[PDB]
Amino acid sequence: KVSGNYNYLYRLFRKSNLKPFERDISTEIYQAGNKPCNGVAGFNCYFPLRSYSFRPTYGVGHQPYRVVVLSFELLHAPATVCGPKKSTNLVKNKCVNF
Amino acid sequence: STIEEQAKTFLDKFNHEAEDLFYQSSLASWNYNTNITEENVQNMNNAGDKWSAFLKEQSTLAQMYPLQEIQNLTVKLQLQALQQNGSSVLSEDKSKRLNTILNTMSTIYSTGKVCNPDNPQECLLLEPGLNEIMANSLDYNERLWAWESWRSEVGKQLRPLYEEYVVLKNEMARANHYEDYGDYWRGDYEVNGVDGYDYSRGQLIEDVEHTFEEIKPLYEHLHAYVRAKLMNAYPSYISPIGCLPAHLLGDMWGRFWTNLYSLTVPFGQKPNIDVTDAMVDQAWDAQRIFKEAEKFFVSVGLPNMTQGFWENSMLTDPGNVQKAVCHPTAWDLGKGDFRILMCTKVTMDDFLTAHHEMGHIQYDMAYAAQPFLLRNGANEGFHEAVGEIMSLSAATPKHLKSIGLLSPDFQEDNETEINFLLKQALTIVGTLPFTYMLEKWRWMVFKGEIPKDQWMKKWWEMKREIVGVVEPVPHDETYCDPASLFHVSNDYSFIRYYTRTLYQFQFQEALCQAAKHEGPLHKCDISNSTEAGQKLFNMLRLGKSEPWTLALENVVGAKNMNVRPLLNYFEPLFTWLKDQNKNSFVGWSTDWSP
Ligand SMILES: *[C@@H]1O[C@H](CO)[C@@H](O)[C@H](O)[C@H]1NC(C)=O
Numbered sequence: 001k002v003s004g005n006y007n008y009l010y011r012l013f014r015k016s017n018l019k020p021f022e023r024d025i026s027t028e029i030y031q032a033g034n035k036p037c038n039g040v041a042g043f044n045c046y047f048p049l050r051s052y053s054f055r056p057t058y059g060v061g062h063q064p065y066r067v068v069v070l071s072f073e074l075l076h077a078p079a080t081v082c083g084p085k086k087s088t089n090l091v092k093n094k095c096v097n098f
Numbered sequence: 099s100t101i102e103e104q105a106k107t108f109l110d111k112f113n114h115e116a117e118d119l120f121y122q123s124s125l126a127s128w129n130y131n132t133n134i135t136e137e138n139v140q141n142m143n144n145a146g147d148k149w150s151a152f153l154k155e156q157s158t159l160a161q162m163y164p165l166q167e168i169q170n171l172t173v174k175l176q177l178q179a180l181q182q183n184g185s186s187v188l189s190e191d192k193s194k195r196l197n198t199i200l201n202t203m204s205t206i207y208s209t210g211k212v213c214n215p216d217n218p219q220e221c222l223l224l225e226p227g228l229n230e231i232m233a234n235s236l237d238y239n240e241r242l243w244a245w246e247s248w249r250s251e252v253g254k255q256l257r258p259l260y261e262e263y264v265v266l267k268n269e270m271a272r273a274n275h276y277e278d279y280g281d282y283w284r285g286d287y288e289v290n291g292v293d294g295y296d297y298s299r300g301q302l303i304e305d306v307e308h309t310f311e312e313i314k315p316l317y318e319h320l321h322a323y324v325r326a327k328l329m330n331a332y333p334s335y336i337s338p339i340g341c342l343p344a345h346l347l348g349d350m351w352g353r354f355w356t357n358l359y360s361l362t363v364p365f366g367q368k369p370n371i372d373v374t375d376a377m378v379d380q381a382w383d384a385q386r387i388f389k390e391a392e393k394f395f396v397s398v399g400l401p402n403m404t405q406g407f408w409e410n411s412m413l414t415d416p417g418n419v420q421k422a423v424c425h426p427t428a429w430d431l432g433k434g435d436f437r438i439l440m441c442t443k444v445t446m447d448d449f450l451t452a453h454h455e456m457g458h459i460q461y462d463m464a465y466a467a468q469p470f471l472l473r474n475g476a477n478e479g480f481h482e483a484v485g486e487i488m489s490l491s492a493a494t495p496k497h498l499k500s501i502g503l504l505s506p507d508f509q510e511d512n513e514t515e516i517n518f519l520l521k522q523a524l525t526i527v528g529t530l531p532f533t534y535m536l537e538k539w540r541w542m543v544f545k546g547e548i549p550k551d552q553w554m555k556k557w558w559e560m561k562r563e564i565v566g567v568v569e570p571v572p573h574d575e576t577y578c579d580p581a582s583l584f585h586v587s588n589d590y591s592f593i594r595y596y597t598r599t600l601y602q603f604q605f606q607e608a609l610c611q612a613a614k615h616e617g618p619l620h621k622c623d624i625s626n627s628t629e630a631g632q633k634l635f636n637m638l639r640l641g642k643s644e645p646w647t648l649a650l651e652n653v654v655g656a657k658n659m660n661v662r663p664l665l666n667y668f669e670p671l672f673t674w675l676k677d678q679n680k681n682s683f684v685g686w687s688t689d690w691s692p
């Protein structure tokens with residue numbers, strides 16, 4: 001949007017590293033400092049999900065982008081999805097290799 | 099554990115929020131530039147209010163954080179840069195008095211009135227008409243009349259307001275546990291933690307002193323030639339043994355001297371380079387100037403400049419539907435938005451200045467990869483120097499003839515070499531000693547050793563020794579010609595100009611001696627020199643993340659500032675001056691004055 005696209009919000013702080021196929025929904029502050037802190041922020045308490053910066057007049061490396069990943073499992077269950085196999089002419093009244 | 103990670107996320111959050119909000123503020127400024135409406139003024143004022151509140155909050159957050167136990171170099175530098183806020187640790191009365199006095203000084207300078215006492219209703223204004231009546235006049239009675247009446251009604255709010263400024267700044271630095279506010283000016287250069295290269299604040303002024311002492315013979319020769327040719331061409335008043343009075347400074351303080359070069363034309367019977375026919379034959383315009391700038395960048399070897407210069411940047415001045423200033427404006431709006439706005443004009447010197455602004459844009463593109471604290475050079479003289487590098491490369495006739503700005507049978511003989519060496523001299527060394535004078539005097543006044551009324555002797559003593567500028571009548575209590583300079587009343591560290599020109603000359607020598615260029619030494623051009631572009635691009639990217647003296651000695655070979663490159667490019671200049679200054683006596687006597 002000309003005035004900005006900030007409806008979504010990206011998470012930055014997670015105190016435990018994740019593994020493949022893992023999500024995060026919690027917004028708990030990354031309390032690295034041992035000083036007392038809970039709920040409302042304060043001394044060394046920064047919100048995980050940081051804001052955006054997105055507008056059309058931007059330059060390089062800051063425009064909104066979309067990423068998709070195609071994944072699948074290997075044959076443990078019966079194979080399910082694959083594309084067409086190319087064919088050719090069928091031929092009538094003539095010797096071929098059917 | 100310790101506050102290492104807390105400081106890390108603190109700097110990170112500041113960088114993100116500063117990027118966002120400063121982008122909004124620059125957006126408001128650019129909206130004002132594109133269109134001037136009072137609502138735009140209110141919007142940018144609100145953006146500035148929000149930004150000031152955010153900066154004060156960040157400084158308050160960073161106030162407690164120490165520097166001694168944290169040993170990370172980048173973290174240390176960023177934290178010490180963030181903790182500094184300026185004049186907020188004082189009491190509010192001093193701050194509000196400072197605001198009022200600076201505002202009233204700005205008002206008295208902006209609307210300070212002087213013109214002909216003949217027709218004051220509608221005449222030439224402060225600029226540029228006063229320039230064309232001082233520097234383009236045949237009689238001097240009106241010239242000195244206006245010169246010495248200029249300070250009789252304006253300096254009254256220039257000298258004592260300067261004193262109030264200096265006392266308030268000194269007391270603020272005292273609250274900051276420092277001595278003066280020019281020390282804070284030069285403190286942007288500060289870096290520590292490197293063995294052997296401990297970096298105080300006085301080495302800057304000492305090095306500047308050495309560089310000016312090296313410069314002094316060059317200006318001695320230059321003023322000798324100027325005096326000889328003015329006595330040959332101006333037999334009107336000035337005596338054959340006198341000097342150059344205050345009515346013949348050519349500017350409001352005597353900075354540029356290309357206009358006075360008219361009185362010091364050695365040879366006018368030999369043709370020189372001119373691009374009027376070449377610019378009205380193929381119809382050169384701002385579009386074509388930018389295209390050939392792209393070609394220049396390609397030939398040098400630097401990579402391409404991003405698309406913000408082809409679509410987002412308005413290539414032309416804003417027509418005549420609206421009205422706005424057309425000062426050279428290279429704006430880094432943020433996140434890859436690089437724009438250049440001016441009142442586009444085609445001239446060889448304007449060619450150089452446009453490439454200077456485009457070098458600014460290239461440097462902005464380079465340091466855009468860094469966070470907000472690192473979105474600037476280790477010194478504030480890097481930007482103008484790196485921009486003017488390509489201009490000084492283009493100050494030579496070689497690639498101007500290469501781009502077809504004149505026929506290839508035009509002689510690249512010795513006369514154009516000598517004349518353009520003298521032109522560069524009048525461009526830079528014609529104002530450098532004045533920079534020495536103003537910066538030394540302002541260091542003294544900021545520190546406070548010099549009485550406010552002593553400036554009559556010592557400063558003028560320098561004018562009796564370094565530049566050769568006098569006055570037919572001594573100045574009075576409130577005549578403050580240094581304050582007549584535009585930048586001094588604008589809260590400017592006036593040594594960063596000299597440090598900038600030192601940086602640009604050192605880099606010019608680095609790209610002229612390491613690029614295998616030969617022939618006449620000035621003829622070196624960075625175009626068609628791949629290694630020069632490569633090594634320049636290696637340097638102009640990091641910013642302040644590392645110390646600058648080590649990199650400076652890598653690129654050129656100087657531990658700090660040095661005018662040895664300046665005379666290296668001016669070795670043909672120095673040789674010609676020695677060739678011409680043997681006819682008679684050279685120099686001036688201090689005792690004798692008009
Ligand atoms: C500025 O805005 C006014 C009205 O808001 C409009 O008439 C004018 O064309 C605009 N000019 C520019 C240069 O945007």
Ligand SMILES: *[C@@H]1O[C@H](CO)[C@@H](O)[C@H](O)[C@H]1NC(C)=O
Binds near residue numbers: 170171172173
């Ligand atoms: C500061 O810490 C970072 C950790 O990301 C490290 O890479 C860097 O080398 C440290 N600074 C110095 C001067 O070693």
Ligand SMILES: *[C@@H]1O[C@H](CO)[C@@H](O)[C@H](O)[C@H]1NC(C)=O
Binds near residue numbers: 396401402403
């Ligand atoms: C990158 O460089 C090429 C070659 O000079 C140029 O054609 C292209 O326009 C440049 N890219 C951008 C975004 O300007």
Ligand SMILES: *[C@@H]1O[C@H](CO)[C@@H](O)[C@H](O)[C@H]1NC(C)=O
Binds near residue numbers: 625626
């Ligand atoms: C360097 O090469 C370019 C073309 O690649 C050419 O236009 C230019 O004239 C060359 N440099 C010189 C000094 O001739």
